[PDB]
Each structure stands twice: as C-alpha cells, then as structure tokens.
Design a protein around this nucleic acid. Structure first.
Ligand SMILES: [Mg+2]
Ligand SMILES: [Zn+2]
Ligand SMILES: [Zn+2]
Lengths: 30, 147, 116, 270, 181, 65, 137, 56, 49, 391
RNA sequence: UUCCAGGCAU
C-alpha cells in the first residue's frame, strides 16, 4: 500500500533527504 | 568536560593499584565527585552513563536523541539482562586494602571531551623583567614575560 | 612540565635509606619508621601481619601525600620487647606465608590442563 | 594433607587466565599480591625509538608510543639487567634487546605493518626475550600502522627492563578479578535498593562456592575474610602463571629487603 | 508536513504516505526520488515566521490524530490531540535545536542553562576538524590521538558528520568520593 | 586513526583483533556485540574500545606523499 | 580502689529501630522500685533484643576486683569483670531531678545515650565520666 | 585609574588551582617551576651566611 | 566549524539593551536554537540557526 | 577581589606539578572552584613587608569575618558529606581502622581511647574518634527540633570538654555557621588552634570516607513506583483546580480583588495553584526517598542540593516564567503554532509537568528555555551593575 | 608597541 500513514521512525528518512539536497551550509551558499 | 556543561580539571593521577576496582576487574579512567550532580541537575549525564554502559555490553549505538521513547525503566531492564545492577551501580573494592566499599558507585562509561586550556600553557611566573617604555611598568602578557 | 620523574617512585635517590626510625615521643616504647620509595602495596601488609603479634600495642600507617612515594609506620609494644623485632618477625611471617603459598599455587598448576 | 597455610586450589585454567580460588590468608595479603602483579612485575618492551625515515600518516611519537605497548617476550627477563645497573655507557646486550622495522608501500593496496615484522638484531643471548608476543589468528599480531604507495618507515627500537610503575607498557598485568564473602556476611557493603535488596542486586557465580545466609542465625561479628576468587589474566609477555608466581615472588623479595635494611641498619654504629 | 484533510477515507492526514518513504529510501539505497520533489509534490512547505502565525501544527505526527482504546507508567506525560484544525506537522521536534545542542545526549533531561554551557565548550574542545590537517599550515590546531566515536548518540549527529569526526572518548566514569582530589 | 594498541582501562592486548572484527561482519555477517564476544573482549572496558574506534587512517592513507 | 555502683534486673517494655540499620533504643521497668525506669540504645547487631526480657544491668568505674591507653588482647588471662554479655562504656552528662527525689542521670557512650530513674543510686551513682555498662542473659 | 591606582608588578605568579585535602588551611602548594622563578632578596647575615652560601 | 558558519550577529543600542532583544521569543521556535547562545556579554544578541 | 579575604597569606609549600594546590576550606572565601580557575599570587620583598602579611593577612586570622561576625570558611563537600556519615549512632569502627585513623591526626596524644563497646568485639563510633580532633574545653549546646538532652533522632549537638556527647555532625555544626563548632574553637582557643582543626577533621573524615566510599546515580532520582503516580494525580487534580477557576472566570463570575484586573486577579490564582501543587509533589518524593538515597544524604549533610532539586528531578519540574508572567502570547493569542488561539490552560502558559527523570516535551522544553534565558540574561547584567555599585 | 575584533572564566 504505497499510501499508508507515516509512523515517527519514518520521518527521520525525510530529514535525510533534506541535507542530501540542501546541506548544512544551505544558507551561506544559495 | 562532558556534554552537560560538566567542567572540571584533573586533580591527581592514580594507577590501578590505588584505583577502585569492581570484581569484574574493570577500573575507572575517570572519577568524578558526586557533588556536581544535585545542584546542577544534569540527569542526562546519569542517563548517558547507563545508556552507554548498555550499548557497550551489547554494542548497539545507544540512542540519546532529543525527545523519544526511551526510559530509565527501559534501559535498567536491558542492563539487567546483562547481569549488572539495574541502575548501573556496582560493588567496588578500595584499591589500597582491597576491602570492599561500604558503598556502591555509579560506575559506567560516558563520553568526555578534552578542551584545550591545559595547565602547561598557563603556568606563568615573573620576578621582574621586561618593562614597558611609556610606563616603565612591567609589560602585559605571559607571552612576553609580562607581570 | 613539573612532572616528577616517573622512576622516582622506587629509586631511592642519593642518600635515602629505605627505613628511618624515629622514636615516638608522644607515647612509651613506640616508634615510627619512614619508608622511602614504597607504599600501600607494602605498607598495609606490614600493618596486617604486624597487627597479629599479641605483643604489639599499636600499629598503623599512612601515605603522607599521594605526590610522594612514602609512608610512616607507627609501632608500639609490650615493654622489654623492642618493636623493631616485631617488624622483623611480622615480615618473615609474610615471607614464610608467601613462600609456602608459592609452593601451593605451583602444586595446583603442574596438576592442570587446557588447550588455549 | 599438608602445607603451613595460604593454600590455593586453581579453579579453571588456560593459557590466558588462571581463574583460581586463593584461600585462608589476610585480605591485606591478597590485595598486596593483586597489586604487585599489576605494578612491579619485571617485563620488557621498547623504550627508545630511532626514526630514520617515515612517510606514514601517524607522525613519529604516535608510532613511537604504540611501539612501547607492543608486548614483547620476557620469559627469562630476570637475566637481562636494567640499563641503569649495567656498566655499559647507555645500553648493551647484557641489558637490552634491539629491534628493527622497515616498510614500503609496494602493494598498491594498503600495506600493513605488524608487530611480527620487528627484527631482533642484538644477540638474544640464547634466551626467551624480545619476541613480539603474537596471539593473532593468522600470526601477524598487533597492527602497528598502514601506508600507501611510496610511503616508507625505517625505525630501530631498544627494549629495556621496566615495571608497571615506570609506565603501563611494562604491565605484564592486564586486569585481575577480585571478590570475597559473596553473600556479604561480614557486611562490608550496604547494598542500595529500591525494594528487595536481593532482587535488584544480581547474585554472583562465586556464591555456589560458599554457604548461603540462613536467616535465624544472628550476626557473626567475629567474621573475618579468607577465600578470594581472583582471575589473573595476562597479555602474553609472561605465562599467566608467572604473572602470579613472580607476583608471589617480587612481593616476597621486597618484604625481605625490609629485613635486609634492618640488618645493614644495625651493623651501623661506630 | 502538509496535513490537509484530503482524505475521503478518514479525516486529516500528512499529505505523504509510507509509499513516498520507501520511494525515497529507494534512493537512500542506490544513492531518484529527491527532496526537491517532496516540495513540488505539494507534500511539504517552507513556512516563514509571519505565515506561521496562521496555522496549527501537531507535534508528533501520528499520536496527535487518531481516536482511542492506561498510558505508559515509565514514559513522560504529553498534551493531547486538541482540535483537527491541524494544517501542518513537525518533521521532528529535535529540529528546533542547532549544531551545538544536537550533540547533547538527552537535552530534554537537564536544567535549561546546563545545555547552554555545552553549547559553548563543544566549541572549546579538541578533535579532527578536517582529515586534511596533514596538508594544513594553519597556525595552531589540535587533534586527538585516538578519537573515539560516542556510545550515546543522536540521529542529529548522523548529519552533523560526527561519528566520523568525533570530539572525545568514551571513558569509564566512576562517580564517587575517593582521595578527595 | 588506527587501532588503539591495547585498551586504556585494563590494557589487555587489542591492536591485532581489529582486522578480525571488521571481518566478523562484512563476511561472517555477525552483529557488533557478538563479534566482540567472539574476539574475547568480555567486560566493556576493552569492548567500548573497538566498538568506538574510528579507523580514520584509511581516509588519511587516501591522500598522497 | 574498685567497686560496683549499681545492680538490678529489668524487663524490656519494647525495642525501637528508628531508621537505624544496626542499633536500637529500648526501655524497661525495674523488678524492684517501680519508679526505676530505664532507657538505653543498643547495638542490636552484637546483642539482639526482643520485647520483654530480664537483663541484669550493672554499672561501676573499674577493672575486676583488683584512665590511660586501652590494651588490646592480652587480657585473655587477665581479670575479667566481664561476667556478662554487653559491655559498653561512655560518659554521664546530666544529673536531673525529676521532682520529689526521683532523680534520673544520663549516660552517653561516645554515641549511644542512656537514662535512669529512682533515688537509691545516692552514695553509689558518681557524676564521673567513667562508668562501664553491663548486660547479661 | 590604570597606572597608579593599579599596576602590573614583579614577583607575581598565576596558574590553575586544584584543591588538596592534605595541606594545612594556611598552606599553598607551589609548583617547583615558580619556586625557581620567583626570588626574594635576603640579606647576608652571619645567621644564614652558611645556608645562603650553599644556596648560591 | 559548523556552528560558527550558521551564526547570527545583531547590533544593539550603545549599551546593554536589557529587555526585548536578548530574550528568547516564541517566533524563535524552530528557527533559532533555544539553548545555544554565548554566555554573558552579548548573551542572546548573537544566535545560532 | 571584592572581599578583604579575597587575598590572604599562605605558607609556601613547594610541590611538584604545575598547579596551585590550596587547602579546601579556604575555597569559599576566594570564591574558588576548579573547573579551569586560575589564581594570582604575589611575593613579599622586605623583612617588614612579609611581616605585614604573616601578622595580618594569614588565613588563620581571616577565619572569622567581621562583615558578618561569623566565620567565613569551614568544612565543605567531601569532608562535610562524610563528617555526617561518620557521626551517626548507627556507625561503628573496629580496632584495625580506628588505629589508622588515630595516627592520621598529627597531634594525637598517642593514647587510644576506650572503645564504647568492649562487649563481644571492641568497637568505636564515628563521634567517638572524630572527637579526637576536637580539642579541650570546647563546649557546644544545640537543640534542633525534637532535641531533648537524650535527643532521639540525634537532633541536637552536645560536645563537652571537646568530646562529641551526642547528635549528628554536619553543616550546622562544622559549617561556617554562627554558634558553629568552628566559630567557637577559634574564639575559645586561638586563630591557630582552629586553623589546624580543619586539618585534623579534614584528614580523618576524609580518610574514613576514602574507604566508606560514596556516590550518586539516576537510581537516586527515581521515587517509589506508586508515590510517583500519587503525584501524577496531585498534578491532574490541580489542572482541574484550574480548569474550574478558568470557566468560573470565563463566565464573568469572580471578584476583582481590590487593585487587580479581572485578568490579574485571575492569573494570580492560576499560578499559586500550580506551584502550590508542584511543591508537595516534591515533598511527596522527598520523605519518600529512604535515608540510603544519595542525593538526599548530601542534602542532609548540607553539602549540595536542596528540597527543590530532588523535586525537579524525581517529581515535577515547574511552571516557567518570564517577568513573573508565565510564557505570553507573542504568537497572537497562543504560545506556539502548536496551540489553538486564546489558550490559557497551564499546558500552554509554560508548566512543566514531567520531571528531569522523565523528560520535557518539545513545548515543555522550549518554554523552559525562554525561562532559563532570563537567568542568563540579567546574570550578565546584575553582575555588571554590581561590579560597579561595588567600586 | 598601536588600533579594531573575537574568545575564556560552570
Ligand atoms: Mg570555574
Ligand atoms: Zn648494559
Ligand atoms: Zn579493557
């Protein structure tokens, strides 16, 4: 069911995506 | 210092012979005084100590992460599956005589940082020396032999 | 920096006899020996055995301060009997105990086996 | 049936542990040895590195430090005097063991430097001494360091006597175990609890070997302490036994030197 | 997380599902489903302070949503799921923190100020600032001989590149009175 | 930053065991805690040692002269 | 110079372990004057005590029939005015007068306290510190 | 304010303090380093003369 | 190295602007760290994202 | 240096290692701790200059501060924490040790004291030997609560001829207290005598505590299984003591207590109720933690921690506030975007229900901050205005 | 030295 709720543990991965793209330096850069 | 604003400079160094030991054989690398806890109220120190003593026996990167579903009640059960006190403490023998410690100690691993600021970069003594020009008063900075 | 020299914990440097016995003046027939380059390892044990001699009135010791490898040992005895001797005896007591103890640990060892 | 007093009765045994039950002695005594083993047992290790060339990532003293930790053989040690005593200006075959080490990163794939690569150059005098104690599965033992392409490293070490007091690298020790009165019948502790002292606090394997409490009975205030369940390990340099015998020995030596000074002291006077 | 009640089968709910996840982790594996899309897919938004003023966020996603059925005697006591007006939701509370904070084990178990001290000394410690110090001619810098990674960690570290470039060691602490030094 | 030759607490030999630990994983596909129980590392003092050391040297070696 | 200064057997009204893992303060009455009450803590780790028991209480500042340091053993042979079980030793602080002439003195033993009452410890109960205590049976 | 009501002076020393339970209240443990750095003018007097000469 | 990169300086009047500024605001939630600020002096005038 | 006693004369005792190793009791007068603190020391130069130091500046003299006609040093930490344990009726020591203790005291007449227990096995009690450090003629009379000459709970403190007759020793007796042992010793004897007393009491108790060991650890912060729940409802009960008095004002039904808005008059009752409840929540876990508990043991000797601490770790934390006014609505009638507007309940004005053992919630957390920040703020102000007001 | 700046003392 590629469409079900989203337990807590899951969210972590989302954040991963963030820094994967953005990056700790996001600000200064862009 | 630790990770809870737990500053502190060494006081003296001892070897295992004088060091306090637990039947297991193990002995502390660090021995912090119990008094820097109640007033500072840094349980997270006590907690990391119990949590790390666990993931150190089983080897499972103990999670400390922000707010989550962990508990002393929880850890104290896993640390009980390993045979050690459920709260971390352990019996210990007074390194000098070998005679047990009428008391028990919160003996468990904790992550500790070593900030620069080491003694030998600060001991400074001056008995007369370089004197400034405009003032003729001793000069500023240990760097320049000041007073 | 001001780190004493490591080896100073067991090397009596220039004129420093192991022992040095000054007669305790506070009490009668009692003394105090200064042990240079020695500690609890040795101390506490001469304390134990020394404290078995019935003829020993007082026996206790102490490390002056953790920075210096030393300790004073105070010994008092039943008059006529010189504490020096008590220390003398109490010592051999330990040698004789150990000696036999070595023999006995070795007895057991020869009579053993394992593959590791 | 025999033997004056302090008797032992080795429980288990192995090439790297002497789990034994020492009994009927003064705890003072027990500890006394316990210490002696960790502390003052003569050993051997490097104590002087002579860096010729080095391209590694570990800078000199890093390597120079670990080299002192690399356990070295010391079975005979007692027949290789401390530099300090011997009369050789600096060092000699009658006080020290000389080793070499040389690495070049040929395998264009991380070349390793192991304790096995040390090279005894000085006359071993025909005596178990100076051998890079190896327990490695393969036999490479103690990974010293690594290096890449044309990374080189030429050294030259010098082992000397030494004991755990002078430094840990001379610790034949490792870590002993210690316990007595597993049922705290002398009450040398006051177990902290939240509820049942008995529950919260785990029991020990060393209880079987001693009688449980048995309520009724009052408190034996005449209770002293014999029977100590030690577990002398080892790091190799010395056979698990000697790190116990010699322990039993070095202590005994000192104990006599006290008498020795009590003799030399008397003779003295005009 | 945009939590529009766009659920004919139910009520309100994160405009993202376990699918999106395994679809992203798909890329976590082979290092295709970007964060960039997690925006365009109107799955989550960038809320500035001002705009925030007009929205309602549920802390922990799950929890503050469903219905019911004695809590946990060991856990803590958390406010309930009040209203369903919920517009968005938090990635994880731990995100209010900054570098410093993020390395502090159980920051939610100390006195407020204590966590501020650690926010200053972490910047006064030793470590391995960059694995290139071998070719670094910077006047002054320290490195620990054997950098140990921490036993107790945060998920926050995984991103702060810590376990790879730690700032200390796991020493066996013994909290007790001894010599008195 | 290489394997810490011998533990800090008890000092029991530990500079060799490295490679054997790294293998009791990538190959013998075990779990940390056990891998270490296998290499003889009993009490935590010596345990935390391996279970924590970060073999940076590798990332170092990866440079040049 | 050596004599007893008080002897009488009492019975334990009751014993109390107020937060004290190894010691208990107790009290009893006298099998003589019924005005002679008694109070005394007690290391119940060296001499248990149950409710109501006849224990001979004695006191006097002396050796055995026949100040300074405290010899260790030796006395294995020596005189032993210890013909009892419990033998503490302390000092006596106050000399109260609980009305009439039913006086009560307090004897502390370096840490444990004690209190008596009646009136015939007249030319017997000295104000002195010295005062070995004794219990038996 | 900074030059007359307060000056920098000679014969002064500063280091990190670490308590000790073995010094009398009034003592102060001093590093051998400073003990060789900080001096004190003493007058040659037949009293010390002998000692003083040894020191020199 | 990081902490310093993501930082925040904010000028003051001319003397200790004791009140509004230095304080921790509600609008601060999620944007600025709540516990990581330089003690004393410019306490709360300089923030970490 | 804001004290007269911020500078004192000490005896040089040249030792190894690079630190200024000073005695402990002279810790609180300099305001000295060891977390990286450095100290300055100057060297006299004239036969008379030093004279001035030794005759007026030595620590032995500065012992009793005139700023408060009461000593300004005294036994602290380790020794304080230990001095108590050693005391207790329930504490005895056998010959082997008692002898070592006696020896450790420099003066000791070299004459062992008579064991209070010659009965089966000769024993000694803390008070017993600890008094070997206490000189002669030193008299003390306390009377705490249930003190009674025969103090049961060891309430008071009676020391005659310099011998501990009864009671426990701690911050009240050996501290820098007024009628304090220390205060008397000095007066009653010399600036000297007392100066050495710290040394004896120190060495002894320090040594005894070396072996009796001591510590703290999470286990001390957990209160009785049900006693905690007993609290979770001592909380909830107040929530409703609020919820009620809220609608009771959400209906225009409350007497605006003279000189207070309906708003003000309201909040005031809110607050009281919470803290009021939180406090007992404390005590609840307080007399609930056995004597064996560590964190208490120290709060008892008086060497670290107070009722409050125990509370905020074991029981309930508290209601955070800024300028007395619990977290405001800088967020248009609410605290965070996690709340529904016009929310006055305690779960929003910043009331930390959990305990440091349990752990704050993302909100409990952020609020605690805004609150914490305030201390830090004036700390760096009140400190400046002071340093000036001082000068 | 000089002038700005930054950092530390829980
Ligand atoms: Mg400080
Ligand atoms: Zn030679
Ligand atoms: Zn180890």
């Amino acid at each position: 069911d590629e469409s079900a709720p989203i337990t807590a543990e899951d969210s972590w991965a989302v954040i991963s995506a963030f820094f994967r793209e953005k990056g700790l330096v996001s600000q200064q850069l862009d | 210092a630790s990770r809870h604003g737990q500053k502190g400079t060494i006081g003296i160094t001892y070897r295992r012979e004088d060091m306090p030991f637990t039947a297991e054989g193990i002995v502390p690398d660090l021995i912090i005084n119990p008094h820097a806890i109640p007033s500072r109220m840094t349980v997270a120190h006590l907690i990391e100590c119990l949590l790390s003593k666990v993931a150190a026996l089983s080897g499972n990167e103990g999670d400390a992460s922000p707010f989550t579903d962990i508990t002393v009640e929880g850890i104290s059960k896993l640390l009980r599956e390993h045979g050690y006190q459920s709260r971390g403490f352990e019996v210990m023998y007074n390194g000098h005589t070998g005679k047990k410690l009428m008391a028990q100690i919160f003996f468990g691993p904790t992550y500790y940082q070593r900030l620069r600021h080491m003694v030998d970069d600060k001991i400074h003594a001056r008995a007369r020396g370089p004197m400034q020009v405009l003032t003729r008063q001793p000069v500023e900075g240990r760097s320049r032999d000041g007073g | 920096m001001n780190a004493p020299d490591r080896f100073e914990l067991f090397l009596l440097g220039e004129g420093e006899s192991k022992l040095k016995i000054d007669p305790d003046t506070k009490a009668p027939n009692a003394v105090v020996i200064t042990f240079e380059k020695e500690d609890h390892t040795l101390g506490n044990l001469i304390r134990a055995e020394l404290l078995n001699d019935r003829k020993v009135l007082f026996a206790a010791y102490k490390v002056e301060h953790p920075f210096f490898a030393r300790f004073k040992l105070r010994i008092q005895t039943t008059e006529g009997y010189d504490p020096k001797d008590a220390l003398k005896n109490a010592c051999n007591s330990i040698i004789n105990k150990l000696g036999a103890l070595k023999t006995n640990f070795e007895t057991e060892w020869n009579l053993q086996t394992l593959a590791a | 049936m025999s033997e004056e007093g302090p008797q032992v009765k080795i429980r288990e045994a192995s090439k790297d542990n002497v789990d034994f039950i020492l009994s009927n002695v003064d705890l003072a005594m027990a500890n006394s040895l316990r210490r002696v083993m960790i502390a003052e047992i003569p050993t051997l290790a490097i104590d002087s590195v002579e860096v010729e060339t080095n391209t590694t990532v570990l800078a000199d003293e890093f390597i120079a430090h670990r080299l002192g930790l690399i356990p070295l053989q010391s079975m005979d040690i007692e027949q290789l005097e401390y530099s300090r005593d011997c009369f050789c200006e600096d060092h000699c075959d009658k006080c020290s063991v000389v080793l070499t080490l040389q690495a070049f990163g040929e395998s264009e794939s991380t070349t390793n430097v192991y304790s096995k690569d040390l090279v005894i150059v000085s006359n071993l005098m025909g005596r178990n001494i100076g051998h890079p104690i190896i327990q490695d599965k393969e036999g490479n033992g103690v990974l010293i360091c690594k290096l890449r392409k044309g990374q080189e490293l030429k050294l030259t070490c010098v082992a000397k006597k030494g004991i755990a007091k002078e430094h840990a690298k001379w610790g034949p020790a490792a870590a002993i175990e210690f316990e007595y009165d597993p049922w705290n019948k002398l009450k040398h502790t006051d177990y902290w609890y939240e509820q049942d002292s008995a529950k919260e606090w785990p029991q020990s394997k060393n209880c079987e070997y001693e009688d449980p409490p048995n309520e009724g009975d009052p408190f034996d205030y005449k209770a002293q302490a014999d029977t100590f369940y030690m577990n002398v390990e080892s790091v190799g340099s010395i056979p698990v036994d000697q790190v116990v015998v010699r322990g039993i020995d070095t202590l005994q030596k000192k104990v006599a030197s006290i008498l020795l000074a009590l003799t030399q002291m008397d003779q003295d006077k005009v | 997380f945009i939590v529009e009640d766009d659920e004919s089968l139910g009520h309100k709910e994160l405009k993202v599902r376990k699918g999106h996840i395994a679809k992203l982790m798909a890329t976590e594996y082979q290092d295709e489903y970007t964060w960039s899309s997690l925006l365009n897919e109107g799955l989550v938004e960038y809320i500035d302070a001002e705009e925030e003023e007009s929205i309602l966020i549920a802390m922990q996603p799950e929890d503050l949503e469903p219905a019911e059925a004695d809590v946990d005697p060991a856990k803590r006591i958390r406010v309930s799921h009040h209203a369903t007006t919920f517009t968005h939701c938090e990635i994880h509370p731990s995100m209010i923190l900054g570098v410093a904070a993020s390395i502090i084990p159980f920051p939610d178990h100390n006195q407020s100020p204590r966590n501020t001290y650690q926010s200053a000394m972490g910047k006064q410690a030793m470590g391995v600032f960059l694995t290139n110090y071998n070719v670094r001619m910077d006047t002054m810098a320290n490195i620990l001989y054997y950098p140990q990674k921490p036993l107790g960690t945060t998920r926050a570290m995984e991103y702060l590149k810590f376990r790879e470039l730690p700032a200390g060691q796991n020493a066996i602490v013994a909290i007790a009175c001894y010599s008195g030094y | 930053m290489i394997v810490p030759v011998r533990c800090f607490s008890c000092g029991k030999v530990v500079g060799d065991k490295w490679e054997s630990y790294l293998n009791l994983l990538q190959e013998d596909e075990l779990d940390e805690g056990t891998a270490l129980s296998r290499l003889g590392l009993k009490r935590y003092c010596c345990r935390r040692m391996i279970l924590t050391h970060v073999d940076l040297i590798e990332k170092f070696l990866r440079y040049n002269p | 110079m050596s004599n007893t200064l008080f002897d009488d057997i009492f019975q334990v009204s009751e014993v109390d372990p107020g937060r004290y893992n190894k010691v208990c303060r107790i009290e009893a009455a006298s099998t003589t004057q019924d005005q002679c009450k008694l109070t005394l803590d007690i290391n119940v780790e060296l001499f248990p005590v149950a409710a109501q028991d006849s224990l001979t209480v004695t006191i006097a500042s002396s050796l055995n029939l026949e100040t300074r340091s405290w010899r260790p053993p030796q006395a294995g042979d020596r005189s032993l005015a210890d013909d009892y079980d419990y033998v503490m030793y302390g000092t006596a602080y106050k000399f109260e007068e609980v009305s009439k002439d039913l006086i009560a003195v307090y004897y502390s033993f370096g840490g444990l306290l004690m209190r008596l009452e009646g009136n015939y410890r007249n030319l017997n109960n000295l104000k002195q510190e010295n005062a070995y205590l004794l219990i038996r049976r | 304010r900074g030059n007359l009501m307060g000056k920098r002076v000679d014969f002064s020393a500063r280091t990190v303090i670490s308590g000790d339970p073995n010094l009398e209240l009034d003592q102060v443990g001093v590093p051998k380093s400073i003990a060789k750095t900080l001096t004190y003018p003493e007058v040659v007097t037949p009293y010390n003369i002998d000692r003083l000469t040894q020191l020199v | 190295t990081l902490s310093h990169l993501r930082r925040t300086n904010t000028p003051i009047g001319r003397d200790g602007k004791l009140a509004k500024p230095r304080q921790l605001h509600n609008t601060h939630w999620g944007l600025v760290c709540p516990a990581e600020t330089p003690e004393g002096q410019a306490c709360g005038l300089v923030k970490n994202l | 240096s804001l004290h007269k006693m911020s500078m004192m004369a000490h005896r040089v005792k040249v030792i190894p290692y690079s630190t200024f190793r000073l005695n402990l009791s002279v810790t609180s007068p300099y305001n000295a701790d060891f977390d990286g603190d450095e100290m300055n020391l100057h060297v006299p130069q004239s036969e008379e200059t030093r004279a001035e130091l030794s005759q007026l500046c030595a620590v032995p003299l500065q012992i009793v501060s005139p700023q408060s006609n009461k000593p300004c040093m005294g036994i602290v930490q380790d020794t304080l924490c230990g001095i108590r344990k050693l005391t207790l009726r329930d504490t005895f020591i056998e010959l082997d040790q008692v002898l070592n203790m006696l020896y450790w005291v420099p003066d000791w007449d070299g004459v062992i004291p008579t064991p209070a227990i010659i009965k089966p096995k000769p024993l000694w009690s803390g008070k017993q030997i600890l008094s070997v450090a206490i000189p002669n003629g030193i008299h003390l009379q306390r009377f705490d609560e249930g003190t009674t000459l025969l103090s049961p709970k060891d309430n008071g403190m009676l020391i005659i001829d310099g011998q501990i007759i009864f009671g426990v020793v701690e911050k009240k007796t050996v501290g820098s207290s007024n009628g304090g042992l220390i205060h008397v010793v000095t007066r009653e004897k010399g600036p000297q005598v007392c100066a050495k007393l710290f040394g004896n009491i120190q060495k002894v108790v320090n040594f005894w505590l070396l072996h009796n060991g001591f510590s703290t650890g999470i286990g001390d912060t957990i209160a009785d299984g049900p006693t905690m729940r007993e609290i979770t409802e001592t909380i909830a009960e107040a929530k409703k003591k609020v919820l009620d008095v809220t609608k009771e004002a959400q209906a225009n039904l409350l007497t605006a207590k003279h000189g207070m808005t309906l708003r003000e008059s309201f909040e005031d009752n809110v607050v009281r109720f919470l803290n009021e409840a939180r406090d007992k929540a404390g005590r609840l876990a307080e007399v609930n933690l056995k004597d064996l508990n560590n964190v208490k043991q120290m709060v008892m000797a008086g060497s670290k921690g107070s009722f409050i601490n125990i509370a905020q770790m074991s029981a309930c934390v508290g209601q955070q506030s800024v300028e007395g006014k619990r977290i405001a609505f800088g967020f248009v009638d609410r605290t965070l975007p996690h709340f529904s507007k016009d929310d006055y309940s305690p779960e929003s004005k910043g009331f930390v229900e959990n305990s440091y053992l349990r752990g704050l919630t993302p909100q409990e957390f952020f609020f605690h901050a805004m609150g914490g920040r305030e201390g830090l703020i004036d700390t760096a102000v009140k400190t400046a205005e002071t340093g000036y007001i001082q000068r």
